[PDB]
């Protein structure tokens, strides 16, 4: 599907993903340094039979920010689409939610965007 | 337009707005206590000739969180629609952005939603 492989955002974070025949996404999200301490599990889904009209391929994934080294009590979803071609990209918007008390719910969820490319920034 | 007047969110914050003939929104956003220290200017726009098919009326507004008492170096936009009837409401999603250094841009913008009614929670 052209999705499988290593992707880099413009801050130089990386994730590696396997797109399954079935529509499964599985892999790992890491800081650009790539040490164990900054790797986290990533699971999601994608449209495994996209349009052939030049549309992108819709996907999303989640990372819970807990590994064997660290727990940020939070989780980020990226929602977006894969766009193929000589300059493939994955264009995304994300929601980072932290666990809060009900008082602090107002500040629970950050929003932002990421463009992933096959080559580093 | 049924928009002019006092609205209350489910946390009991309030804003008072005047909808102008021209599409202008002007007024004040306050904490439920309503003291001067928690009042802020609000300006926005609305669709002054909405559909008559039972659609809502689109609007939005901004509050910069600076008054004579306080500066939170931040600003919130509410984007949504006004829905008339015996139980009028304004259904909204909001973006709260704080001024940050470029390092801290990731945490610059919170997202959430508000339902405003004519009666308090």
């Amino acid at each position: 599907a052209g999705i499988t492989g290593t992707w880099y955002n413009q801050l130089g974070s990386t994730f590696i993903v396997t797109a399954g025949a079935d529509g499964a996404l599985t892999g790992t999200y890491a800081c650009g340094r790539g040490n164990a301490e900054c790797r986290y599990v990533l699971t999601g889904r994608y449209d495994s039979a996209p349009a052939t009209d030049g549309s992108g391929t819709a996907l999303g994934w989640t990372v819970a920010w807990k590994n064997n080294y660290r727990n940020a009590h939070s989780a980020t979803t990226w929602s977006g689409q894969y766009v193929g071609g000589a300059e493939a990209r994955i264009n995304t918007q994300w929601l980072l939610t932290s666990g809060t008390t009900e008082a602090n719910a107002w500040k629970s969820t950050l929003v932002g965007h990421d463009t992933f490319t096959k080559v580093k920034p | 337009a049924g928009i002019t007047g006092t609205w209350y969110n489910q946390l009991g914050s309030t804003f008072i707005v005047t909808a102008g003939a021209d599409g202008a929104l002007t007024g004040t956003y306050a904490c439920g206590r309503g003291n001067a220290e928690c009042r802020y200017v609000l300006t926005g726009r609305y669709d002054s000739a909405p559909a008559t098919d039972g659609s809502g009326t689109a609007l939005g507004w901004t509050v910069a969180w600076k008054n004579n008492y306080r500066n939170a170096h931040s600003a919130t936009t509410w984007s949504g629609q006004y829905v008339g009837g015996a139980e009028a409401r304004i259904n909204t999603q909001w973006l709260l952005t704080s001024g940050t250094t470029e390092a801290n841009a990731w945490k610059s913008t919170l997202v959430g939603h508000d339902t405003f009614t004519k009666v308090k929670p």
């Binding site: 130089g12 974070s13 980072l96 | 945490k107």
Partner: peptide, 7 residues
């Protein structure tokens, strides 16, 4: 800081 953005 947060691991989504740490170097």
């Amino acid at each position: 800081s947060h691991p989504q953005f740490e170097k």
